[PDB]
Amino acid sequence: CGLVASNLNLKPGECLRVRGEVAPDAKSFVLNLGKDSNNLCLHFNPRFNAHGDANTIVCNSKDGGAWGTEQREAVFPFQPGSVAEVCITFDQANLTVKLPDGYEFKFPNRLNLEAINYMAADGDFKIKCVAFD
Amino acid sequence: CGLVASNLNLKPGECLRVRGEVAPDAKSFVLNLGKDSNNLCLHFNPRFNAHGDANTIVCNSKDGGAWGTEQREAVFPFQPGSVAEVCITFDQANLTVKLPDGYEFKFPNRLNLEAINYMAADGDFKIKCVAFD
Ligand SMILES: CCCO[C@@H]1O[C@H](CO)[C@@H](O[C@@H]2O[C@H](CO)[C@H](O)[C@H](OCc3cn(Cc4ccccc4)nn3)[C@H]2O)[C@H](O)[C@H]1NC(C)=O
Ligand SMILES: CCCO[C@@H]1O[C@H](CO)[C@@H](O[C@@H]2O[C@H](CO)[C@H](O)[C@H](OCc3cn(Cc4ccccc4)nn3)[C@H]2O)[C@H](O)[C@H]1NC(C)=O
């Protein structure tokens, strides 16, 4: 279990940047953002080799303990054994996730949060820097 | 009120770097480090004007919920309404706190922590970046 941060008070339009090292033998990692562990406006889960999935980004939400409808993206800008940065913002409609190699996508904001107050990391990603703007 | 982080997994000799904004009207700010909120190897409290102190850094420990004996430092390289970086490392004997303008001091590792897993900020300091070397 990785870095957990609370009281982030990330407001709409503000950018959260996370840089970390993807393990050489990475199978998958997770960043979770929301209010708390039961209330996630974004579960961001790059799977290198996990749950039968290869090089696929899986996203979902969690509302009051309940997983939402999973979505998958079609580009995988991560390499095992490399440094990677992820930049996330939000407004009421969407979270915007910016990734390496120029890639960016939106994930619908399915929760009702005023601010993002909680982050949690897990899996094969060693966090080196977190910045809150 | 400020950022709280857990699972930091900071080990001896590793450097924790915290940058933030000292409020324009700053009276006092706090960085706490330790095992958890009740076991602090460092309560780092620069006081511009607070609790009977002017321009003084007060340091303490907290062991099983009980405050230790305060140590007052001899230097104060902080100003209201500025950016500041604090860098912290530790070993068996001491925490070393590096401050702006080349200042540093040591505070004894009273709890004999071999790992720092918790950090929390409070007061007139807005954390903008946290980095691990
Ligand atoms: C009959 C259809 C079954 O579909 C499958 O159902 C699985 C179980 O629900 C889906 O897997 C889950 O997808 C969720 C997002 O939709 C989460 O990713 C679930 O894992 C949550 C989790 C585990 N961990 C610990 C962890 C994570 C990464 C590395 C190391 C530890 N942290 N969060 C993950 O278990 C999996 O994505 C899903 N696959 C498909 C293609 O739909
Ligand atoms: C009138 C003289 C009595 O002596 C005073 O007794 C106080 C209470 O024990 C001493 O203050 C406490 O010292 C502790 C360390 O030894 C902690 O600094 C106590 O504050 C804990 C705290 C409050 N906060 C919230 C906060 C922090 C900064 C700004 C705004 C909110 N966070 N941590 C702080 O209230 C204060 O250090 C002490 N001063 C002197 C000069 O001896």
Report whether B60 belongs to an annotated binding site.
yes
How far is the CA of B109 from the CAs of A51, B13, B36, B75, B96, in angstroms? 44, 13, 15, 20, 10
Domain count, chain B: 1
- C-alpha neighbours within 13 Å on the C-beta side of residue B20: 25
3-state SS, residue B94? strand
**Can you read off the two tokens belonging to residue A66?**
């309940």
3-state SS, residue B39? strand
3-state SS, residue A27? coil
Structural domain boundaries enclosing A81: 1-133
Helices (H), chain A: none
Structure obtained using: X-ray
- H and E: helices and strands count for chain B: 0, 12
Beta bridge partners of A54: A49
How far is the CA of A122 from the CAs of A33, B66, B86, in angstroms? 12, 32, 27
What is the greatest pairwise CA distance in chain B?
37
User: Which chain A residue lies closest to B128 (C-alpha atoms)?
Assistant: A132
Q: 């940058």: which residue's tokens?
A: B19
Q: 């912290």: which residue's tokens?
A: B88
**Can you read off the two tokens belonging to residue A17?**
């940047």
Residues 6+ apart with CB under 8 A from A27: A47, A48, A49, A50, A123, A124
Q: What residue ranges in B74-115 does DSSP mark as E strands? A: 82-90, 94-98, 104-108
What is the C-alpha to C-alpha distance for residues B33 and B39, in angstroms, rounded to an integer? 8
Q: Quick one: CA dihedral B111, B114, B120, B121, positive or negative?
A: positive
Mutate to test the interface with A, among B30, B127, B133 (most CBs of A within 10 A): B127
Q: 């040591």: which residue's tokens?
A: B106
Q: 């897993």: which residue's tokens?
A: B117
Q: A112: domain CATH number?
A: 2.60.120.200
What is the C-alpha to C-alpha distance for residues B27 and B24, in angstroms, rounded to an integer? 9
**Can you read off the two tokens belonging to residue A54?**
């290869």
Residue A56 CA to chain centroid, in angstroms? 13
Mutate to test the interface with B, among A6, A7, A8, A11 (most CBs of B within 10 A): A7
- Strand order of the sheet with strand B125-132? A104-108, A94-98, A82-90, A16-22, A125-132, B125-132, B16-22, B82-90, B94-98, B104-108
Q: What is the 3-state secondary structure (H, E, C) of chain B?
A: CCCEEEEEEECCCCCEEEEEEECCCCCEEEEEEEEECCEEEEEEEEEEEECCEEEEEEEEEEECCEECCCEECCCCCCCCCEEEEEEEEECCCEEEEECHHHCEEEEECCCCCCCEEEEEEEECEEEEEEEEC
User: Which chain A residue lies closest to B17 (C-alpha atoms)?
Assistant: A129
Resolution (angstroms) equals: 1.5
